[PDB]
Amino acid sequence: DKICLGHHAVSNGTKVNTLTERGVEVVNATETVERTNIPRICSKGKRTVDLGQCGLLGTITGPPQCDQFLEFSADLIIERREGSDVCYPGKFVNEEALRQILRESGGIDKEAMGFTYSGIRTNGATSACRRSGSSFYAEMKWLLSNTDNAAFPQMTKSYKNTRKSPALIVWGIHHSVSTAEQTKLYGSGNKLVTVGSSNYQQSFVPSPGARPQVNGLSGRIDFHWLMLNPNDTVTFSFNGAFIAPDRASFLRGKSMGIQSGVQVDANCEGDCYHSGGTIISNLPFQNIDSRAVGKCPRYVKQRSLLLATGMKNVPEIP
Amino acid sequence: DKICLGHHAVSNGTKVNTLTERGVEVVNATETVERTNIPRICSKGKRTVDLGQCGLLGTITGPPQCDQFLEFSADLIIERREGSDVCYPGKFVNEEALRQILRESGGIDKEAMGFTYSGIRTNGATSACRRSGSSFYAEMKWLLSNTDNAAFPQMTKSYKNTRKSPALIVWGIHHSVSTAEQTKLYGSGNKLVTVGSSNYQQSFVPSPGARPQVNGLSGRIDFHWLMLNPNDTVTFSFNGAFIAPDRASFLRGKSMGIQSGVQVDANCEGDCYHSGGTIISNLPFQNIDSRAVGKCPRYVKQRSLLLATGMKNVPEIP
Amino acid sequence: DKICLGHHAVSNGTKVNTLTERGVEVVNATETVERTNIPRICSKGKRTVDLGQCGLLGTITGPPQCDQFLEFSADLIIERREGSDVCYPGKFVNEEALRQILRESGGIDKEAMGFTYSGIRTNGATSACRRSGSSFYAEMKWLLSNTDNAAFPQMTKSYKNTRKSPALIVWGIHHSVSTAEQTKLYGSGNKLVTVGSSNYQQSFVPSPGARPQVNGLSGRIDFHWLMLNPNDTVTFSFNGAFIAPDRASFLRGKSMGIQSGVQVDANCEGDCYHSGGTIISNLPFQNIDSRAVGKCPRYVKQRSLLLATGMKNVPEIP
Amino acid sequence: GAIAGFIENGWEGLIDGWYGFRHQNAQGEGTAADYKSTQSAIDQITGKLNRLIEKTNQQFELIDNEFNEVEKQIGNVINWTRDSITEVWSYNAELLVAMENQHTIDLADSEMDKLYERVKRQLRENAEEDGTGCFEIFHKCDDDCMASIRNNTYDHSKYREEAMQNRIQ
Amino acid sequence: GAIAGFIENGWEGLIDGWYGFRHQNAQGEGTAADYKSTQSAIDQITGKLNRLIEKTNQQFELIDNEFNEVEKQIGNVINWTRDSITEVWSYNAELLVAMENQHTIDLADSEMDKLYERVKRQLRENAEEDGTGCFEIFHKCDDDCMASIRNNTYDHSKYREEAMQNRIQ
Amino acid sequence: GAIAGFIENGWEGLIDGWYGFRHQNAQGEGTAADYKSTQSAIDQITGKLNRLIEKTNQQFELIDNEFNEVEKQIGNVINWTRDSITEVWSYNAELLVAMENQHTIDLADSEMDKLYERVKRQLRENAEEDGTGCFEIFHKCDDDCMASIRNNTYDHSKYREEAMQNRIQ
Ligand SMILES: CC(=O)N[C@@H]1[C@@H](O)[C@H](O[C@@H]2O[C@H](CO)[C@H](O)[C@H](O[C@]3(C(=O)O)C[C@H](O)[C@@H](NC(C)=O)[C@H]([C@H](O)[C@H](O)CO)O3)[C@H]2O)[C@@H](COS(=O)(=O)O)O[C@H]1O
Ligand SMILES: CC(=O)N[C@@H]1[C@@H](O)[C@H](O[C@@H]2O[C@H](CO)[C@H](O)[C@H](O[C@]3(C(=O)O)C[C@H](O)[C@@H](NC(C)=O)[C@H]([C@H](O)[C@H](O)CO)O3)[C@H]2O)[C@@H](COS(=O)(=O)O)O[C@H]1O
Ligand SMILES: CC(=O)N[C@@H]1[C@@H](O)[C@H](O[C@@H]2O[C@H](CO)[C@H](O)[C@H](O[C@]3(C(=O)O)C[C@H](O)[C@@H](NC(C)=O)[C@H]([C@H](O)[C@H](O)CO)O3)[C@H]2O)[C@@H](COS(=O)(=O)O)O[C@H]1O
Ligand SMILES: *[C@@H]1O[C@H](CO)[C@@H](O[C@@H]2O[C@H](CO)[C@@H](O[C@@H]3O[C@H](CO)[C@@H](O)[C@H](O)[C@@H]3O)[C@H](O)[C@H]2NC(C)=O)[C@H](O)[C@H]1NC(C)=O
Ligand SMILES: *[C@@H]1O[C@H](CO)[C@@H](O[C@@H]2O[C@H](CO)[C@@H](O[C@@H]3O[C@H](CO)[C@@H](O)[C@H](O)[C@@H]3O)[C@H](O)[C@H]2NC(C)=O)[C@H](O)[C@H]1NC(C)=O
Ligand SMILES: *[C@@H]1O[C@H](CO)[C@@H](O[C@@H]2O[C@H](CO)[C@@H](O[C@@H]3O[C@H](CO)[C@@H](O)[C@H](O)[C@@H]3O)[C@H](O)[C@H]2NC(C)=O)[C@H](O)[C@H]1NC(C)=O
Ligand SMILES: *[C@@H]1O[C@H](CO)[C@@H](O)[C@H](O)[C@H]1NC(C)=O
Ligand SMILES: *[C@@H]1O[C@H](CO)[C@@H](O)[C@H](O)[C@H]1NC(C)=O
Ligand SMILES: *[C@@H]1O[C@H](CO)[C@@H](O)[C@H](O)[C@H]1NC(C)=O
Ligand SMILES: *[C@@H]1O[C@H](CO)[C@@H](O)[C@H](O)[C@H]1NC(C)=O
Ligand SMILES: *[C@@H]1O[C@H](CO)[C@@H](O)[C@H](O)[C@H]1NC(C)=O
Ligand SMILES: *[C@@H]1O[C@H](CO)[C@@H](O)[C@H](O)[C@H]1NC(C)=O
């Protein structure tokens, strides 16, 4: 009479690693490194905006591409590669910092700044901002002299942020293709634009000169921005080449922004994104994208790390 | 006759975590994550200066708030929120980098640079730097034309660092409220300031224009700085709007700087600080402040991680 | 009759650390932290260039020191402390970023940009760039007015990158010792240089003024650079004080750059470098240099961490 | 037609548990799983899994740009930092799994020993180890007797006389 | 009025040591702590503590500013780096404690087994395990005999005749 | 002139293996190494070494400059990041080595127990533990008999009568 103590075993053994052995068979194992990607932006539960052809910074200035998003609201913001911040050729100074701010803004609320002008044209328009006909940035004013080559009067405009949140202020400096064009628009002589706050001080001069044609145009407008503290005031002093703001922007709340090239899905619920889609996983690690954002498993180099969920596999003696 | 082997146990069991179990009781445990904060700056053994209303950068330029600290010496430097680097409204370019330098300087030693002037006023003063009466930055010279609207002569001043340590040099550019004010102080025409070294080259133009009133003033002075290598020379070329240095600064030795809003204590001995006080602990981790500086236990998210200091608790069968 | 089970032991025991004990003796141990340095740059298998007196950025502009390296090719690039990017005193804007680019370029291929000039001298030379006689940067052109004090004509030069790789473009702004010297070289009046691309826009004005003598000279040339995308175009608009490029640069492939002060060795095969030599080791950690580059063991604070390669040593009862 | 326990071989027929009993008597051969040992091992392994599922509440946002590449210097600093951090997590992950797997294997071996040692203490002086993980029982043990061993209701006092006799000669 | 050892229950009365002896003979019942096993466990646990007290000589200084906030881009890079590092240390801390605690528990169990096995080897053929962590001694063992077991001065040769007799019948 | 095994002392004469046998009989005294136990320990230790040799394919490049020092702010950020990372690896390294060493020591102790327990199961009822890691064999065991124990060809059935006799009286 005999009684034996034993343990189960299989022929279906899977290899894992330990401190000592490499490829020691265990009865059962599971993966810890996620590799399964969902090639969509799972947006269920999240108020989502797909900017498409609108560049994120364009939502503040307002090229025609961004007219739907001038006061957008979102929990999830999606930039697209085709997006452009600009109609009339140009770029923002400190662009990325501004992008990072808008990605978590929750969208923007616009408010008029109340600038009034005399002895000056404000209807500066271009063929590059076609809206029905020739037009310009929706939130901005292209100020000219009055007739042609006429002198641009020195002006000083101020705006106080009477709200409890900081105000996002944007202005542009216009660089003509030639000093001949600059004079035709703003008059002769050197041009200066000064922007003063109570924690900010900068200055600007235009740089007329030939540049490669972008959108058929060789001129450039470069945008600058600041955040205005509550009850603080910004003051603009200028005499030409100045692209004035019409409205200020206020951040709505909280959001997250991503860059993607896959469709959106409002059925799937996700919380970790990358340009190629959504990672939904309870696994601690992932090998899909090192730059994935949101609440994600940590990125690792390895495509597979098997965790033993069973004892060492010892085949029965036949 | 019988002999049994056993181990101790308690009813006073404390729960801990392992690889497998969560809340397994052990006989005894101790905390590894420090949460006990001392709401003071324990300074015993450390030569400490509480700048109070003096901003750290003000120790170099010398607003009235910083007159006690123009040549301060310390092991521990404490910035306060009420501190201001400035009397006449303005700010430093690359301010934070300069702060980080002064926080570990051990204080500053000042030395005259020996600039002499002719055909020019040096007594530029303001109501914002009240010292008995109207005055100016103690280490600087506000240079004017001579009478009013008169031309400011082109000047060139140089200084060699004849010491073995690098010299901290600071100058200011003055931005008047209007071109009318700039002309009244330095004369008509464009103004240029050039600063040349043997590893540094920069240039400056003033930007007259209306700005919001700070301290009742709409003008701005922005300060610039460099470190001068031994036996190297700085040269200043200018024709107005230039705030000249009178003395250079030399770093004394070694220190550490903090920002705090709690009192100082010279009885307590500490070595890890944050804005809310001192962390004195032999524990490996802490959950008080992620930005704590000095010699600190590593910051963690968790408020508690209990380490078993005793065996697994197994209650006696009653 | 008796049989005993035992294990080996030595008197030659070496101490190690565990979770519990500190200095517990084991029969055998090995080191995990590399401290053995080879004070040479082991270059076998790697095409190596020792720039010596040539600064890396000088390979693009071409001071006499860099004439051998104007189109160099390498897998391993070595900067030396004696190296200089410059003959006529000056420096690059955003120098380090440019260095990091060239360190992994695999060397550079130069191509003429095809600029032609009329009504202007191009033979600007200096005593500081002695090549047989007075000369200038080999890849650049020092443009003057024509006679002396004569007006410098407004010019506009463009260049398209017709290749499939981005083009490295470099230009210089010349800052004369005085406005008298600037006028003598480029004529009176303000001078402007504008540089336009299709993703880049910058502007430049010269700053004449006295500066400390470097290489006997008080003038400064500061170099600026951009990367030009394929089929994109750069345009230069200027009227003086402009140092024009003659050739553009294209990156060859892939390389790695180091800074060192030890000799080179083409017999040794290495893959981890620091300024003091080469680390060749299969060990996971090293305590030689925290800034070591290449494929390296991780740097640690500790000079020694002994790993037990044998059982606990228990001396025989004598 | 011999049977053997752990110590060179597991049982591919034990399909209702991790650890178990296998007997042979006049009634024939049988195999049954032990619950308490099986559940202890299962509770510990699943305990590890839950610990590794505990998600992080740390949210991270974009710090660079893959459409409009950031400035070179700050971009290289960022890449250098991320790659440094990826090396750290890759290391951590590798070590964590290797460590847990070593422990999983060891605690499983532990449960096997504990089950064997328990049975040995049940049988007292009425059995001897055959060295293959089995016990030679020196008395008649029918199916009911075998079952009594499995549910710890085996009273060694009942068979001790008969067993010591068969053992001693 | 039975006594039992480790294996389902510890002793809340053992208050002068971690591991100990509990006997019953004609003289009554008694409990005493074993020094060598207790000290070994205490030395190992305190050894862990010292290792975790070994302070760092690395000093860190301010890299941003909570009065005058630094520039957005460099500020977000810094925050991203710090938060990344905090995640790493939070992970390390959690794992370190869980790992050490598992080891603390296991080595404590180890000391218990080692003490039990030692006593078993002292008693040789003069005792049998009852399966509750105790030994049934098959000879008369007064307090002096019990004490001899605790200080390892027990000579099994002295009681072997008497013990084998009582065991065999 | 007594011999002793593990349990207070190793053997400085065992120079051809990690684990081994030491006997004494009428033929005298002898010592031989056990292969299977020695190789298992050696295979596991060397297995650790290979794991720690597995090199990284991650290449890192210069991010600052020791000839021309980078800008202060970005330079301090970089130093802060590197020093933060060095602290992490110094921690990892220290813990890894301490952890592996604890495991190396424990698995070595494990192999010793496993060898002892195997021999115990070979000898069945023909021997008794002396408590120093040895077995008192209660029959005549010449060199050939001793060798049979070392290569697991010892049949306890052959000596059982003689052994039980000598044990019982
Ligand atoms: C390549 C080719 O065959 N033809 C291109 C034309 O596309 C383009 O022609 C026009 O040129 C005139 C002067 O050269 C204008 O610049 C005009 O630009 C406008 C516009 O239509 O958008 C005209 C607007 O009325 C202007 N608005 C204001 C407020 O001034 C404005 C302005 O002239 C400039 O845009 C300011 O930079 O825009 C062109 O459509 C011409 C491109 O002009 S440019 O060289 O980029 O200045 O180039 C021809 O070769
Ligand atoms: C808001 C209100 O009711 N009144 C404020 C006044 O506080 C202030 O009056 C003074 O205005 C004159 C010219 O407008 C001066 O700017 C003067 O500033 C001084 C000063 O007292 O600090 C005068 C000094 O003598 C000047 N020193 C030198 C070397 O020039 C100096 C200089 O004028 C300016 O500070 C240079 O920017 O400072 C005021 O006290 C006036 C504020 O003046 S400002 O608009 O900021 O230029 O504004 C009234 O509305
Ligand atoms: C310290 C001392 O005893 N003597 C130094 C001289 O070394 C040096 O003399 C020369 O001064 C003249 C005008 O002052 C020139 O600047 C000249 O510089 C040259 C040169 O030789 O490299 C002359 C070239 O022909 C010029 N080329 C062009 C295209 O203009 C060029 C130019 O003049 C300047 O370099 C532009 O900055 O270079 C000197 O060799 C003098 C140094 O001159 S400077 O102050 O740095 O301008 O200083 C004396 O005190
Ligand atoms: C081999 O190991 C894997 C991994 O542990 C085992 O698969 C696991 O099986 C359990 C139960 O069958 C699953 O638990 C599940 O939890 C979810 C969420 O609470 C619940 O909705 C399900 O109804 C289920 O209870 C577990 O997720 C699953 N894991 C994986 C990765 O599939 C498997 O059973 C093991 N094989 C053997 C033969 O034991
Ligand atoms: C439960 O665990 C805690 C933590 O180990 C035990 O408290 C500890 O007790 C020891 C001695 O009583 C303390 O050591 C001390 O060291 C300092 C510094 O060298 C010395 O000045 C003291 O005189 C003392 O020797 C240790 O610090 C202390 N730890 C804590 C966190 O208080 C406690 O004894 C354990 N409980 C039981 C019932 O064992
Ligand atoms: C004490 O521990 C050290 C470290 O493990 C032992 O030294 C090691 O010895 C082995 C074989 O003697 C070496 O393996 C070698 O591998 C290389 C590369 O494949 C091969 O070319 C050699 O021919 C050899 O097979 C190993 O590198 C070596 N390690 C070190 C650090 O020297 C040593 O044997 C141990 N001492 C005792 C008494 O066991
Ligand atoms: C708001 O601004 C005014 C002047 O613009 C100033 O006097 C006041 O102190 C500020 N704060 C509040 C709370 O009114
Ligand atoms: C110091 O400066 C002078 C000129 O200012 C220079 O000639 C000399 O080489 C420098 N160094 C020493 C050690 O004098
Ligand atoms: C190249 O540049 C020309 C104008 O310079 C432009 O029309 C064309 O679209 C660009 N791309 C290709 C592929 O030709
Ligand atoms: C950062 O890494 C990405 C992916 O490897 C690369 O595309 C990018 O060029 C890198 N950034 C810089 C500034 O080189
Ligand atoms: C960095 O984090 C702190 C604390 O969460 C926050 O107050 C600060 O705004 C952050 N920095 C930037 C630039 O957003
Ligand atoms: C970074 O650290 C190195 C080495 O400690 C030091 O020499 C250098 O000055 C540091 N960088 C800055 C910007 O302080």
Give the chain A residue nearest B222 (alpha carbons).
Answer: A201
- Spatial contact of E126 and E160, defined as CB atoms under 8 Å apart: yes
With a CB-CB cutoff of 8 Å, which residues 50-109 of chain D face chain A?
A: 52-53, 55-68, 70, 82, 86-87, 89-90, 92-94, 97-102, 104-105, 108-109
Residue A224 contacts residue A93 (beta carbons within 8 Å): yes
Query: Residue D57's closest chain B neighbor by CA?
Result: B301
Note whether F63 contacts D80, CB cutoff 8 Å: yes
CA–CA separation, C16 and C24 (whole Å): 5
Residue E85, C-beta contacts closer than 8 angstroms, at least 6 positions apart: F84, F88
Are B85 and B63 a contacting pair, CB within 8 Å? yes
Number of CB atoms found within 10 A of residue B81's CB: 11
Please give the Cα distance from F136 to E125 (Å, whole number): 13
| Beta carbons of F86 and C18 less than 8 Å apart | no
Give the residue numbers in C contacting E (CB under 8 Å), as ranges: 17, 19-22, 301
Q: Which residues of C touch A212 (CB under 8 A)?
A: 158, 196-198, 232-235
**B30 strand-pairing partners:** B307
Q: Any idea which ligand is nearest the CA of C209?
A: 3
User: Measured from the CB, is residue F65 less than 6 Å from ligand 12?
Assistant: no
Question: Which residue from B93, B215, B50 is spatially nearest to B59, judged by alpha carbons?
Answer: B50
Give the up-direction half-sphere exposure of residue C307: CA atoms within 13 A in the CB hemisphere.
24
Helices first, then strands: H and E counts in chain D: 4, 4
Cβ-Cβ contacts under 8 Å, B235 against chain C: 209-212
On the 0-12 / 13-18 / 19+ scale of CB atoms within 10 A, B112 is exposed
Give CA–CA dist E30/E146, Å, rounded: 10
Task: Please tell me the distance from the alpha carbon of residue C50 to that of residue C261, in angstroms, as a whole number.
Answer: 11
Q: Taking chain C, what is the end-to-end CA distance rounded to the nearest angstrom?
A: 22
Which residues, 6 or more positions from F152, have their beta carbon under 8 angstroms from its beta carbon?
Answer: F118, F122
Ligand 1 atom nearest A178 alpha carbon: 47
Distance CA D143, CA D125 (A): 20
What gap in Å lies between CA C111 and CA C77, rounded to an integer?
22
Q: Which residues of B touch A194 (CB under 8 A)?
A: 175, 207-211
Helix%, strand%, coil% for chain B, nearest 5? 10, 40, 50
Question: Residue D98: its chain F contacts at CB < 8 A?
Answer: 51
Within 8 A by CB and 6+ apart from A80, the residues are A50, A51, A52, A53, A259, A260, A261
F102 closest CB neighbour out of C18, C296, C302: C18
User: Of F23, F74, C219, C304, which is closest to residue E70 (Cα–Cα)?
Assistant: F74
Confirm or reject: Cβ of D75 under 6 Å from ligand 10: yes
CB burial of F31-48 (b: ≥16 within 10 Å; e: otherwise) equals bebbeebbebbeebbebb
Q: Where are the domains of chain A?
A: 1-46+263-318, 47-262
Architecture of domain C47-262: Alpha-Beta Complex (3.90)
Question: Ligand 6, atom 31: nearest CA belongs to which residue?
Answer: C30
Token reading at C16: 């190690």
Q: Take atom 2 of ligand 10 and give the residue whose Cα is closest.
A: D79
Domain A1-46+263-318 adopts which CATH fold?
Hemagglutinin; Chain A, domain 2 (2.10.77)
Are C242 and C141 in contact by the 8 Å Cβ rule? The answer is no
**Measured distance CA(A228)–CA(A218) in Å, rounded:** 32
Among protein residues, the one whose CA lies closest to atom 9 of ligand 12? F69
- If you take atom 5 of ligand 10, which residue's CA is the nearest one? D79
Q: Which residues of A are annotated as a binding site for Ca(2+)?
A: 71, 109-110
β partners of residue B294: B272, E60
Q: Check if D30 has its Cβ closer than 6 Å to any atom of ligand 10.
A: no
Distance C63 CA to ligand 9 centre (A): 35
C162 burial level (CB within 10 Å; 0-12, 13-18, 19+): exposed
Nearest-ligand number for the alpha carbon of E86: 11
- Compute the nearest-CA separation of A119 from chain D (Å): 40
CA torsion sign for C15, E54, B308, B298 is negative
Contact residues on chain E for D122, CB-CB shorter than 8 A? 131
User: How far is residue F11's CA from residue F8's CA, in Å, rounded to a whole number?
Assistant: 10
The answer to whether C296 contacts F60, with C-beta atoms less than 8 Å apart, is yes
Query: How far is residue F97's CA from residue E54's CA, in Å, rounded to a whole number?
Result: 16
User: Angle formed by the axes of helices E72-123 and A95-103, to 10°?
Assistant: 60
Contact flag E44-C22 (C-beta cutoff 8 Å): no
C-alpha–C-alpha distance, residues D52 and D102, integer Å: 16
List CB contacts of C289: < 8 A, sequence separation 6 or more. Answer: C274, C275, C276, C279, C299
Q: DSSP states of C189-245 as a string?
A: S---EEEE-SS-EEEE---------BTTB--EEEEEEEEEPTT-EEEEEESSSEEEE
C110 known member of a binding site: yes
Residue with tokens 């899905």: A265
Q: State both tokens at F29.
A: 């005294």
10 Å Cβ neighbour count for B179? Answer: 15
CB atoms within 10 A of CB F155: 10
Pairing of strands A76-79, A256-259: parallel
| Alpha carbon B161 to chain centroid, angstroms | 24
Q: Is F121 in the pocket of ligand 12 (CB under 6 A)?
A: no
F79 lines ligand 12 (CB under 6 A): yes
Q: Are strands C33-34 and C285-286 parallel, antiparallel or unpaired?
A: parallel
Tokens describing residue E142: 């007064």
**Pairwise CA distance, residues F90 & F85, whole Å:** 9
Q: Is A208 in the pocket of ligand 1 (CB under 6 A)?
A: no
Q: Which residue has the least CA distance to atom 13 on ligand 12?
A: F75
- Tokens (6 digits) for A72: 């957008």
What distance in Å separates the CA atoms of residue C260 and residue C254, rounded to the nearest whole number? 20
Tell me the ligand closest to B211's alpha carbon: 2
Structure tokens belonging to residue C184: 């003598």
Best residue in F15, F61, F119, F138 to probe C by mutation, most C CBs within 10 Å? F61
Length of chain F: 169
Say how far apart CA C38 and CA B104 lie, in whole Å. 35
Q: Using a CB-CB distance cutoff of 8 angstroms, which residues of chain E are in contact with residue F168?
A: 164, 168
Q: What is the DSSP letter of C82?
A: T
Angle between helices E35-51 and E72-123 in degrees, nearest 10: 170
C229 at interface of A, judged by CB pairs closer than 8 A:
no
Q: Hey, which residues does B214 pair with through a beta bridge? A: B217
What's the A196 CA to ligand 2 centre distance in angstroms? 17
Residues whose CB falls within 8 Å of the CB of residue E74, separated by 6 or more in sequence, listed in order: D74, F73, F74, F77
Residue C263 makes CB contacts below 8 A (sequence gap 6+) with: C40, C41
Residues making up the binding site of B: 71, 109-110
CA dihedral C255→C258→C263→C269, nearest 10 degrees, is -50
The full set of domains in chain F, from first to last, is 1-169 (3.90.20.10)
CB atoms C212 and B203 under 8 Å: no
What lies within 8 Å, CB to CB, of A76 at 6+ separation is A41, A43, A46, A47, A48, A49, A255, A256, A257, A258
Classify residue B86 as left (phi > 0), alpha (psi -120 to 50) or beta: beta
Residue B145 and residue B151 in contact, taking contact as beta carbons nearer than 8 Å:
yes
* Mutant choice from C211, C215, C217, C221 vs B, greatest count of B C-beta within 10 A: C211
* Structure token pair of residue D59: 């949210």
Geometric angle at alpha carbon A248, from A132 and A103, rounded to 5°:
90
Residue F101 contacts by C-beta under 8 Å, 6 or more apart in sequence?
C16, C17, C18, C24, C26, C307, C308
Structure tokens at B178: 């209007």
